[PDB]
Amino acid sequence: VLKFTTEIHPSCVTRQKVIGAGEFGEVYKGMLKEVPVAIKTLKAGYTEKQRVDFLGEAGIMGQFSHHNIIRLEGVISKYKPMMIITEYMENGALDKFLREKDGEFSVLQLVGMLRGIAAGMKYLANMNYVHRDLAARNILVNSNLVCKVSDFGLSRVLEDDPEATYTTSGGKIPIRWTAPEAISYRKFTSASDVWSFGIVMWEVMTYGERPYWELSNHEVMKAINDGFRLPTPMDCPSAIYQLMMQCWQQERARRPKFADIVSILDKLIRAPDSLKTLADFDPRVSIRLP
Numbered sequence: 001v002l003k004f005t006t007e008i009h010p011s012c013v014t015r016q017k018v019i020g021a022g023e024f025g026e027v028y029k030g031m032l033k034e035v036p037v038a039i040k041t042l043k044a045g046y047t048e049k050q051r052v053d054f055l056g057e058a059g060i061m062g063q064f065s066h067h068n069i070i071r072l073e074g075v076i077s078k079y080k081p082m083m084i085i086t087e088y089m090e091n092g093a094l095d096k097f098l099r100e101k102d103g104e105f106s107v108l109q110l111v112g113m114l115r116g117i118a119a120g121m122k123y124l125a126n127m128n129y130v131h132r133d134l135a136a137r138n139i140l141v142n143s144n145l146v147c148k149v150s151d152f153g154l155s156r157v158l159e160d161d162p163e164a165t166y167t168t169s170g171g172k173i174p175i176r177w178t179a180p181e182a183i184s185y186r187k188f189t190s191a192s193d194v195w196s197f198g199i200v201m202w203e204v205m206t207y208g209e210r211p212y213w214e215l216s217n218h219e220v221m222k223a224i225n226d227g228f229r230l231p232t233p234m235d236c237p238s239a240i241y242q243l244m245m246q247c248w249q250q251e252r253a254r255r256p257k258f259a260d261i262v263s264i265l266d267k268l269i270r271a272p273d274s275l276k277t278l279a280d281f282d283p284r285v286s287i288r289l290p
């Protein structure tokens with residue numbers, strides 16, 4: 001897969017600002033000889049596994065060509081430190097973006113973000129790629145408000161995400177984003193990604209609220225097994241809440257496919273008055289005045 005990738009010479013790459021970090025490398029904003037890029041490094045002393053996982057992310061990204069999937073510019077593999085270079089998403093991770101922009105977008109803009117995410121996910125699913133870690137923290141946002149799916153690879157995806165925790169039976173999983181069958185018996189498919197997408201829908205419509213609030217991981221699993229689901233966000237179109245609820249069907253076969261999700265979101269956006277009908281919000285506070 002690396003043969004598809006452009007090998008970039010180090011002298012074309014200028015790292016400027018540190019935007020992400022880890023123990024074995026950092027992510028930078030930089031310039032590529034005259035365009036802005038993001039640059040992820042892998043420090044010397046890396047293991048064979050680290051090299052295979054690191055370059056494997058670029059290999060996977062290089063197989064994709066879609067508006068809603070992060071674009072690979074190239075790799076530096078013949079010099080050290082090794083680097084992966086992608087387009088630069090000016091607004092960063094979607095979860096933090098929404099929390100910093102609380103209430104600043106229209107309902108139509110929020111639904112448009114979800115349509116872009118769904119289109120990227122439909123592409124991945126049809127390319128036989130199961131994400132396993134779909135969440136707003138793994139979506140990136142550009143200066144056109146376009147949302148693109150990121151975080152690709154094999155074992156590195158769940159291993160590197162601190163939201164993914166060790167379960168009781170083994171399996172490092174981000175519990176509150178993960179479908180029941182993936183938690184219970186390790187069955188990760190595009191239909192478990194659809195469950196996760198429903199959680200992403202709730203994250204977007206709430207401007208980055210943490211799913212299930214302070215419930216512990218076990219409390220979340222128990223609640224889901226007992227039939228409870230996340231309540232409607234504030235100011236949420238009825239059609240949007242209905243859609244996220246169908247993503248959370250216990251029976252995998254009853255969930256919409258991403259093809260269905262993209263179609264529904266596209267129809268709602270193209271007839272935007274449909275989004276004015278709101279699901280009832282259950283208030284958690286009563287304010288009474290004479």
Ligand SMILES: Cc1cccc(Cl)c1NC(=O)c1cnc(Nc2cccc(C(=O)N[C@@H]3CCNCC3(F)F)c2)s1
Nearest residue numbers: 019020027038039040070084086088089092093150151
């Ligand atoms: C360079 C690269 C290699 C392999 C995979 C990927 Cl997806 C990438 N590209 C990126 O990480 C990025 C592309 N554009 C980015 N823009 C950006 C700008 C400002 C802040 C953030 C941001 O929230 N970045 C996340 C925060 C969590 N840690 C990883 C991070 F990238 F730093 C992102 S990061």
